[PDB]
A paper describes a structure:
Although the electron density was of extremely good quality, the N-terminal part (aa 1–37) and one short stretch (aa 286–291) were not visible. The crystal structure of PE-H represents the first structure of a type IIa PET hydrolytic enzyme thus closing the gap between PET hydrolytic enzymes of type I and IIb. The loop arrangement narrowing the active site cleft in the wild type enzyme is stabilized by a polar contact between the hydroxyl group of Y250 and the backbone amine of E102. In WT PE-H, residues of the loop connecting β3-α2 (F98, V99, S100) together with D129 and I219 are arranged in a way that access to the active site is limited, whereas PE-H variant Y250S shows a much deeper cleft. This suggests that in PE-H a conformational change is necessary to accommodate a substrate. Interestingly, wild type PE-H was not found to viably bind the tested substrates in the active site, but substrate molecules accumulated in an adjacent groove.
In this study, we have identified the protein PE-H, a novel polyester hydrolase from the marine bacterium P. aestusnigri which hydrolyses different polyethylene terephthalate substrates with mono(2-hydroxyethyl) terephthalate (MHET) as the major hydrolysis product. The PE-H protein shows a canonical α/β-fold consisting of a central twisted β-sheet composed of 9 β-strands flanked by 7 α-helices on both sides, as already reported for homologous structures, i.e., cutinases and PETases. The highly conserved residues S171, D217 and H249 build the catalytic triad which is located closely below the surface with the S171 position known as the “nucleophilic elbow”. Two disulfide bonds are present in PE-H connecting C214-C251 and C285-C302 as is common for type II PET degrading enzymes.
Author numbering: 39 to 285, 292 to 306
The structure:
């Protein structure tokens, strides 16, 4: 077992339920303070001890919807999860990496803020990022910098595999089969193929998915849940109970380097 582990021994049904074992509350973050634009912190209630913390970032101009599903969903298994608002002063992947870093810095600071609802809840050494589109390129950039312990690019877009090739964190890429914005063959697939051998990694292509398919809140929640929640459990919490879900008709392609070393 792991000192960080939370919640019951898992199952597929537990992962695919709308919520995990913890009740969740939320708290708004101002753009004036944050450095990253606004956001929303989701956190479990009725818990003690520190837990992993995750930034969830969007990144597509004129998006019709965003990544909000991940907030309450992931927090309810035992994480502090902050979604970033859609309309911000950030745009292409370089700026998204800065945005992510500013959001991580902000969350670290909350652990010691007397007046924060998440005071004392954050293990500042156990940080993850989930990021969509240009935010997915940003996620790969930040994964290469060596602070975060887990990365989940959603339908990532970028101009280079340079950062993917240098990822320092366990990386799970969700690809969207039918994506016309960041086509898999030009973005998610070559990014995955460039990832180092020295990290745990996975590639999950979601059958029929548009560019929005990794965002949650549509018809793909089962696959997102099984792989995404388990990714954070294994990699932020060192929780080997979740290896079983990582190592199917909704999946049109898969790659990985199981078995993952404990
Ligand atoms: Na297709």
């Amino acid at each position: 077992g792991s000192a960080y582990q939370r919640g019951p021994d898992p199952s597929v049904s537990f992962l695919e339920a709308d919520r995990g074992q913890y009740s969740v509350r939320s708290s708004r973050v101002s753009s004036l303070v944050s450095g990253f634009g606004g956001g929303t912190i989701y956190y479990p209630t009725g818990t003690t001890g520190t837990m992993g913390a995750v930034v969830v970032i969007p990144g597509f101009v004129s998006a019709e919807s965003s990544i909000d599903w991940w907030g309450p969903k992931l927090a309810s298994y035992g994480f502090v999860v902050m979604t970033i608002d859609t309309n911000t002063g950030f745009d292409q992947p370089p700026s998204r990496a800065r945005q992510i870093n500013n959001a991580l810095d902000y969350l670290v600071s909350q652990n010691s803020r007397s007046s924060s609802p998440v005071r004392g809840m954050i293990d500042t050494n156990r940080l993850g990022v989930i990021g969509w589109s240009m935010g997915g390129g940003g996620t790969l950039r930040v994964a290469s910098e060596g602070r975060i312990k887990a990365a989940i690019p959603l339908a990532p877009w970028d101009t280079t595999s340079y950062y993917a090739s240098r990822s320092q964190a366990p990386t799970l890429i969700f690809a969207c089969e039918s994506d016309v914005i960041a086509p898999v063959l030009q973005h998610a697939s070559p990014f995955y193929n460039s990832l180092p051998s020295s990290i745990d990694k996975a590639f999950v292509e979601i059958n029929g998915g548009s560019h929005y398919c990794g965002n949650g809140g549509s018809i793909y929640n089962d696959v997102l849940s099984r792989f995404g929640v388990s990714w954070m459990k294994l990699h932020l919490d060192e929780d080997s109970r979740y290896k079983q879900f990582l190592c199917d008709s909704q999946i049109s392609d898969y790659r990985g380097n199981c078995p993952y070393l404990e």
